[PDB]
Amino acid sequence: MHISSQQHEKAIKSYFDEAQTQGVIIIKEGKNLSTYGNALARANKEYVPASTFKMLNALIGLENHKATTNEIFKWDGKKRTYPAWEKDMTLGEAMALSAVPVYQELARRTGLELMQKEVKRVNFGNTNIGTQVDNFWLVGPLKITPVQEVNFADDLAHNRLPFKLATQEEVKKMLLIKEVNGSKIYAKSGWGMGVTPQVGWLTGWVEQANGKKIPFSLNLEMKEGMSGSIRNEITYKSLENLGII
Template sequence: MARSGRSLFIISITIISIITLLTFTSLPGISATSKINEHPSVIAQSVNLGAAFKELNIEGSILIYDQNNQKFYQHNASHNSTAFLPASTFKILNSLISLETGVIKDEIAILTWDGIMREFPTWNRDTNMRQAYKDSTVWFYQVLARRVGHERMQQFINQVGYGNRQIGTPEQIDKFWLSGPLQITPKQQIEFLQRLYRRELPFSQRTFDVVQDIMIIEKTPNYILRAKTGWATSVKPNIGWFVGYLEQNNNVYFFATNIYMKDAADAPKRIELTRRSFKALGLL
């Protein structure tokens, strides 16, 4: 009987231990910490990227691709599959094509301003590609597009597989990315940026070197951020873009932020939404 009683006691203790373990591991604080330590990507899966959109009173989407873990994190999946005018985000590809075809020698070759006063003071001056990319100078890239020409531009866009590949008639050569018919989805932006990063596009190493360098908008000892903004004013509401990729922690995070912009006050929110989303993922 004593041996039997001891066995029952041991069984009871075991059952209690199991119940206790199950109870504590089901608590959010304990289970989340354990899983996050073992699998860092769980952090991103549990983060609500829509919070920043509510905080900033903005409608739109963000899509982030974690290369090492091969995972997408997003807000507003249907929006990320919707095509929009690329606006000035097309300057990335326009730069690649213009350098590759030799219509401009390099990123410091200067084009002369035509003297026409435009809405932004930084546009009203002679400039080069490095500065024009930074200032998003429309006329500079329109000159480059006209120099490339309709036929060569269409050939490169077809080879790259950029967006819907439609650039319209020869008369639209300097505005097809601003007012159509060229359109691209946030998902397609990510695909293009991945191929750019991996240098899987039909351009020389020199062209890649130059464009990836002028794309840098922030560089610290901890990360490099390459990106381009875009602002489509030919549609209502206006469409705002911020696309690029973040290199941090021996990893690359490709992103495409797309928002509806009510006015100029919403312009900075393209970048702020992206930064908040990265911070929510433990980056930047």
């Protein structure tokens, strides 16, 4: 509309600056990528995917019959970092809670050889999973750029990934995080705990009421003390500033 690009860029930059971190949000409209934020050079830099990999882990596990969407993964009874992980849950529940143990079990079911084949087949990030099937998305060697993440989101949103349609639809159902006046936001957060500096992600898309899908990827540095919700807050403020929601 009437707001200048200068003003949108200043606003979105300010959301990162006010959080006292450095980051970017990339938005894709059709084929065009737009880069906003306070550290634009991050757009083509590699970071661990962290829990954003759960989207791909789920696609792989479902496609390869290593789980179903109704299967309840039982809690083993051992102490976890958060109480919400000390419970039985499905893949979709684990997606929302970013329950690493569930997705480590899924990864171990898939196994190293198949996992590597599938990550290569999808062309995800640097494509390298190394030798440890249960943490390769967390500590390396798998890495991905924000441009690659928004492009993955665009692929999933439009059922373009090399998986069955129904596999993609199943995973997409797991990713609904917010509804805002008629728009739906599908996304997965990431937080690279135990990498340094720590990366934060929120990668997904907006499905507008008219059916248009607008992929995005937020990437920032998570600082001591920071709440995970800052990823969501910056994302929503940016999308709102641009009129996408």
